[PDB]
Design a protein around this motif. Structure first.
Motif, PDB file in Angstrom:
ATOM      1  N   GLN A  66       0.831  -1.194   0.000  1.00 11.37           N
ATOM      2  CA  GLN A  66       0.000   0.000   0.000  1.00 11.37           C
ATOM      3  C   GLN A  66       0.872   1.252   0.000  1.00 11.37           C
ATOM      4  OE1 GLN A  66      -4.086  -1.107   1.777  1.00 11.37           O
ATOM      5  NE2 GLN A  66      -2.731  -0.932   3.558  1.00 11.37           N
ATOM      6  N   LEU A  67       0.256   2.375  -0.374  1.00 17.04           N
ATOM      7  CA  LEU A  67       1.014   3.607  -0.556  1.00 17.04           C
ATOM      8  C   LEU A  67       1.684   4.054   0.741  1.00 17.04           C
ATOM      9  CD1 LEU A  67       1.983   5.910  -2.272  1.00 17.04           C
ATOM     10  CD2 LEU A  67      -0.244   7.017  -2.002  1.00 17.04           C
ATOM     11  N   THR A  68       1.003   3.897   1.879  1.00 19.12           N
ATOM     12  CA  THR A  68       1.584   4.341   3.145  1.00 19.12           C
ATOM     13  C   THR A  68       2.921   3.665   3.418  1.00 19.12           C
ATOM     14  OG1 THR A  68       0.168   2.713   4.258  1.00 19.12           O
ATOM     15  CG2 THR A  68      -0.569   5.014   4.241  1.00 19.12           C
ATOM     16  N   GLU A  69       3.123   2.450   2.905  1.00 20.10           N
ATOM     17  CA  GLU A  69       4.372   1.738   3.143  1.00 20.10           C
ATOM     18  C   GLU A  69       5.567   2.428   2.496  1.00 20.10           C
ATOM     19  OE1 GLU A  69       4.194  -2.471   2.685  1.00 20.10           O
ATOM     20  OE2 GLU A  69       1.994  -2.530   2.715  1.00 20.10           O
ATOM     21  N   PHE A  70       5.333   3.364   1.575  1.00 19.15           N
ATOM     22  CA  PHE A  70       6.396   4.144   0.954  1.00 19.15           C
ATOM     23  C   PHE A  70       6.428   5.578   1.462  1.00 19.15           C
ATOM     24  CE2 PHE A  70       5.227   0.861  -2.161  1.00 19.15           C
ATOM     25  CZ  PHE A  70       6.445   0.231  -2.300  1.00 19.15           C
ATOM     26  N   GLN A  71       5.619   5.903   2.465  1.00 19.87           N
ATOM     27  CA  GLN A  71       5.555   7.260   2.978  1.00 19.87           C
ATOM     28  C   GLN A  71       6.756   7.550   3.867  1.00 19.87           C
ATOM     29  OE1 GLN A  71       1.932   8.165   5.075  1.00 19.87           O
ATOM     30  NE2 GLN A  71       2.290  10.380   5.035  1.00 19.87           N
ATOM     31  N   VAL A  72       7.246   8.787   3.793  1.00 19.18           N
ATOM     32  CA  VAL A  72       8.346   9.253   4.626  1.00 19.18           C
ATOM     33  C   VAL A  72       8.002  10.651   5.119  1.00 19.18           C
ATOM     34  CG1 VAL A  72      10.020   7.886   3.327  1.00 19.18           C
ATOM     35  CG2 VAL A  72       9.688  10.304   2.749  1.00 19.18           C
ATOM     36  N   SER A  73       8.706  11.081   6.160  1.00 16.39           N
ATOM     37  CA  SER A  73       8.537  12.443   6.639  1.00 16.39           C
ATOM     38  C   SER A  73       9.113  13.421   5.622  1.00 16.39           C
ATOM     39  CB  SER A  73       9.217  12.632   7.994  1.00 16.39           C
ATOM     40  OG  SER A  73      10.630  12.638   7.863  1.00 16.39           O
ATOM     41  N   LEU A  74       8.528  14.618   5.576  1.00 13.61           N
ATOM     42  CA  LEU A  74       9.027  15.639   4.665  1.00 13.61           C
ATOM     43  C   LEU A  74      10.488  15.963   4.955  1.00 13.61           C
ATOM     44  CD1 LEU A  74       8.223  17.536   2.339  1.00 13.61           C
ATOM     45  CD2 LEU A  74       7.653  19.245   4.073  1.00 13.61           C
ATOM     46  N   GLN A  75      10.862  16.005   6.237  1.00 14.97           N
ATOM     47  CA  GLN A  75      12.236  16.338   6.603  1.00 14.97           C
ATOM     48  C   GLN A  75      13.207  15.291   6.076  1.00 14.97           C
ATOM     49  OE1 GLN A  75      10.181  15.432   9.918  1.00 14.97           O
ATOM     50  NE2 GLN A  75       8.907  16.757   8.626  1.00 14.97           N
ATOM     51  N   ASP A  76      12.858  14.009   6.216  1.00 15.29           N
ATOM     52  CA  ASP A  76      13.750  12.950   5.758  1.00 15.29           C
ATOM     53  C   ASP A  76      13.925  12.995   4.244  1.00 15.29           C
ATOM     54  OD1 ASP A  76      14.372  11.818   8.281  1.00 15.29           O
ATOM     55  OD2 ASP A  76      12.465  10.730   8.290  1.00 15.29           O
ATOM     56  N   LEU A  77      12.841  13.235   3.503  1.00 13.45           N
ATOM     57  CA  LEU A  77      12.967  13.346   2.054  1.00 13.45           C
ATOM     58  C   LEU A  77      13.809  14.554   1.673  1.00 13.45           C
ATOM     59  CD1 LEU A  77      12.373  12.686  -0.878  1.00 13.45           C
ATOM     60  CD2 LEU A  77      10.212  13.931  -0.644  1.00 13.45           C
ATOM     61  N   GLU A  78      13.607  15.682   2.356  1.00 11.16           N
ATOM     62  CA  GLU A  78      14.409  16.866   2.069  1.00 11.16           C
ATOM     63  C   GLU A  78      15.883  16.614   2.351  1.00 11.16           C
ATOM     64  OE1 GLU A  78      12.345  19.814   4.420  1.00 11.16           O
ATOM     65  OE2 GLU A  78      11.343  20.623   2.641  1.00 11.16           O
ATOM     66  N   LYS A  79      16.188  15.789   3.353  1.00  8.68           N
ATOM     67  CA  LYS A  79      17.576  15.429   3.613  1.00  8.68           C
ATOM     68  C   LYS A  79      18.111  14.475   2.552  1.00  8.68           C
ATOM     69  CE  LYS A  79      20.612  14.159   7.468  1.00  8.68           C
ATOM     70  NZ  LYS A  79      20.680  13.754   8.903  1.00  8.68           N
ATOM     71  N   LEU A  80      17.259  13.595   2.017  1.00  4.76           N
ATOM     72  CA  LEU A  80      17.702  12.665   0.982  1.00  4.76           C
ATOM     73  C   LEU A  80      17.905  13.372  -0.352  1.00  4.76           C
ATOM     74  CD1 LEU A  80      15.375   9.602   1.713  1.00  4.76           C
ATOM     75  CD2 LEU A  80      17.815   9.787   2.234  1.00  4.76           C
ATOM     76  N   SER A  81      17.030  14.319  -0.682  1.00  4.91           N
ATOM     77  CA  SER A  81      17.077  14.988  -1.975  1.00  4.91           C
ATOM     78  C   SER A  81      17.933  16.245  -1.972  1.00  4.91           C
ATOM     79  CB  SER A  81      15.663  15.366  -2.419  1.00  4.91           C
ATOM     80  OG  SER A  81      15.127  16.367  -1.569  1.00  4.91           O
ATOM     81  N   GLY A  82      18.231  16.805  -0.804  1.00  5.91           N
ATOM     82  CA  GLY A  82      18.890  18.094  -0.755  1.00  5.91           C
ATOM     83  C   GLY A  82      18.013  19.237  -1.213  1.00  5.91           C
ATOM     84  N   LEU A  83      16.695  19.097  -1.091  1.00  6.60           N
ATOM     85  CA  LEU A  83      15.749  20.115  -1.518  1.00  6.60           C
ATOM     86  C   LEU A  83      14.913  20.583  -0.334  1.00  6.60           C
ATOM     87  CD1 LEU A  83      14.393  18.445  -4.802  1.00  6.60           C
ATOM     88  CD2 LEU A  83      16.248  20.117  -4.600  1.00  6.60           C
ATOM     89  N   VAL A  84      14.296  21.748  -0.505  1.00  6.56           N
ATOM     90  CA  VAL A  84      13.320  22.285   0.437  1.00  6.56           C
ATOM     91  C   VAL A  84      12.039  22.524  -0.349  1.00  6.56           C
ATOM     92  CG1 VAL A  84      12.766  24.090   2.100  1.00  6.56           C
ATOM     93  CG2 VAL A  84      15.142  23.350   1.804  1.00  6.56           C
ATOM     94  N   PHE A  85      11.005  21.746  -0.050  1.00 13.61           N
ATOM     95  CA  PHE A  85       9.743  21.834  -0.769  1.00 13.61           C
ATOM     96  C   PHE A  85       8.832  22.876  -0.135  1.00 13.61           C
ATOM     97  CE2 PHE A  85      11.365  17.501  -0.945  1.00 13.61           C
ATOM     98  CZ  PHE A  85      11.471  17.302  -2.307  1.00 13.61           C
ATOM     99  N   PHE A  86       8.099  23.600  -0.983  1.00 11.97           N
ATOM    100  CA  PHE A  86       7.114  24.585  -0.549  1.00 11.97           C
ATOM    101  C   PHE A  86       7.690  25.455   0.562  1.00 11.97           C
ATOM    102  CE2 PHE A  86       4.712  20.736  -1.848  1.00 11.97           C
ATOM    103  CZ  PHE A  86       4.110  21.248  -2.981  1.00 11.97           C
TER     104      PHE A  86
END
Ligand SMILES: [Cl-]
Ligand SMILES: [Cl-]
Ligand SMILES: [Mg+2]
Ligand SMILES: [Mg+2]
Ligand SMILES: [Mg+2]
Lengths: 304, 300
Positions: free
Chosen positions: A205-225
């Motif tokens: 299910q989709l939730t199994e791929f969900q991550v915190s915004l902070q963790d994704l921003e640390k993985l991508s080196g981006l700041v969203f919105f």
DNA sequence: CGGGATATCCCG
DNA sequence: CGGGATATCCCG
DNA sequence: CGGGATATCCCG
DNA sequence: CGGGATATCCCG
């Protein structure tokens, strides 16, 4: 004044500036020949219209310097598909908008099954959200994440394809931001998801791929919105909403229905029906009417 | 129409040029290393009192901590902290030198490479100030692909520390030199790509030279954009030498400098002996300092 | 010039 | 307890 | 909805 | 010769 001498011949250019199109914006990665991020806004009215992807063609973005641009020769035969970040289905309202989603600046090498399967279903859920939220913003892009070896060493390893060395991401990300209404004081809903660039079945299910915004921003080196106030109330999209993708039955029935239009012989159209019955999926009234009237169309063709 | 799209702003890549006392850089938040570092060298800047030993590697306070590297990432990693803008180019200012120790200017570098071949390249860049009034240098890391025997091309690099600092496979340097603001001689340019590994003295610097076009395609960058490409621009390895210090010259300077830090006649005499074992003849500058530090240590 | 390791000590 | 500052030593 | 393949034409 | 351009066919 000592800055003037340093800057005399200009700072080196990275080419990361935001590029805007009819209904999406993106930041390009000139080294990897893929988009860094792709921002889009979808509404109820945008996902409707007469624009047709079969009238579109993958081609390099004319605004990208060809020295940093990907080309179809990099993708064709590579074993990877051309994966749109801003989907075409989000731009049925404008043929120009849809045509721009086929620029290679919006494309990454994507697993064939992932592109037409799990990722396709995430894109469908994003459009379904327009029935429950007035506005939906989506940011999508590639990722190259490290793998821990048996010796504890962490290594990033990814393939580059074609003569231009187009980078193949190990994962794809999606950030979804939804506002219920322009008048409601209800808090905004957000979700960040990271999916591996590979065949994902119907069980996860989709939730199994969900991550915190902070963790994704640390993985991508981006700041969203960045304008969004994180002190404010921002609810988890998967708590306000279902984060629920189409199951095997619903997804197969929709594809089968859509593939009626592309049937070129009675035998090919009959094989669609055969597939549904092997899957124990009962056709709905919408499928049967389209099925029978397409059958009559092809029968008359076989007379001439 | 674009207003609704950007209502909450576009994503931030954080690639804007950052300016410091005597260098500028673009930071790579995903890899936790600089993307490029621009510096302008002159003979006046390479002289002064700024001391290397009075500086410390520390996070750049201008970088968001979420995207910053930390000394914990480097120590024990098997990789050294390698500056792109060298501290040796900022002897004229203690502030400028300290800023070259911000981790925003640092990449994981091979110990031997950092103290050896790459160190000699930096020395050559400073040597160019004796023959050119102005020297511009852009340095940065690269993660280049490797073609396997079966044809597949792969980019593979290590990440170190809890923050996954990218260890580059190669380092690049682009050197631009102008004889003087008065002269009309064409500018001299050179681009070099060096593998992040121990090299030695056999290879000549020209063996690592590349076309600017090729480096720009490898890195995804466009260097010196205001430089007119149709103009006359000369290969710096033709106008100049591109000759790095050889074993004898390099070792003699290192042995000379290490006198300053000798805290015993024994370890001082060992410098001499090591120099002798290498068959190098010491010069007068070495001996003069050898005696003062020998006499100074006689006293104590 | 470019980089390190280790013992000692401080005190939040 | 344990991270951090500082001598003090070392390498190429 | 999301992606491919192959044939055959034109003509600078 | 080689790159567009259509047409036809197919997959999940
Ligand atoms: Cl899938
Ligand atoms: Cl070396
Ligand atoms: Mg897709
Ligand atoms: Mg069919
Ligand atoms: Mg160094």
């Amino acid at each position: 004044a000592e800055k003037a001498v340093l800057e005399q011949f200009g700072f080196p250019l990275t080419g990361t500036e935001a590029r805007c199109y009819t209904n999406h914006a993106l930041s390009y990665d000139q080294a990897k020949r893929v988009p860094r991020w792709v921002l889009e806004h979808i509404s109820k009215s945008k996902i409707m219209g007469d624009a047709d992807r079969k009238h579109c063609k993958f081609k390099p973005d004319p605004n990208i310097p060809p020295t940093f641009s990907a080309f179809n020769e990099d993708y064709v035969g590579s074993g990877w598909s051309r994966g749109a970040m801003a989907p075409a289905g989000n731009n049925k309202f404008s043929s120009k908008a849809m045509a721009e989603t086929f620029y290679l600046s919006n494309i990454v090498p994507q697993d064939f099954d992932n592109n037409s399967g799990y990722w396709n279903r995430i894109e469908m859920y994003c459009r379904e959200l327009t029935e429950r939220f007035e506005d939906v913003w989506v940011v999508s892009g590639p990722l190259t994440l490290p793998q821990t070896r048996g010796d504890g060493k962490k290594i990033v390893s990814y393939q580059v394809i074609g003569e231009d060395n187009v980078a193949v991401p190990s994962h794809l990300y999606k950030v979804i931001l939804a506002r219920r209404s322009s008048v409601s004081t209800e808090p905004l809903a957000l979700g960040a998801f990271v999916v591996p660039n590979e065949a994902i079945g119907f069980q996860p299910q989709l939730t199994e791929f969900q991550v915190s915004l902070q963790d994704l921003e640390k993985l991508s080196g981006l700041v969203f919105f960045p304008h969004l106030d994180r002190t404010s109330d921002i609810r988890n999209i998967c708590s306000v909403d279902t984060c629920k993708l189409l199951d095997f039955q619903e997804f197969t029935l929709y594809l089968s229905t859509r593939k009626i239009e592309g049937a070129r012989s009675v035998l090919r159209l009959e094989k669609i029906m055969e597939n549904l019955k092997n899957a124990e999926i009962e056709p709905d009234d919408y499928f049967m009417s389209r099925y029978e009237k397409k059958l009559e169309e092809l029968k008359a063709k076989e007379q001439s």
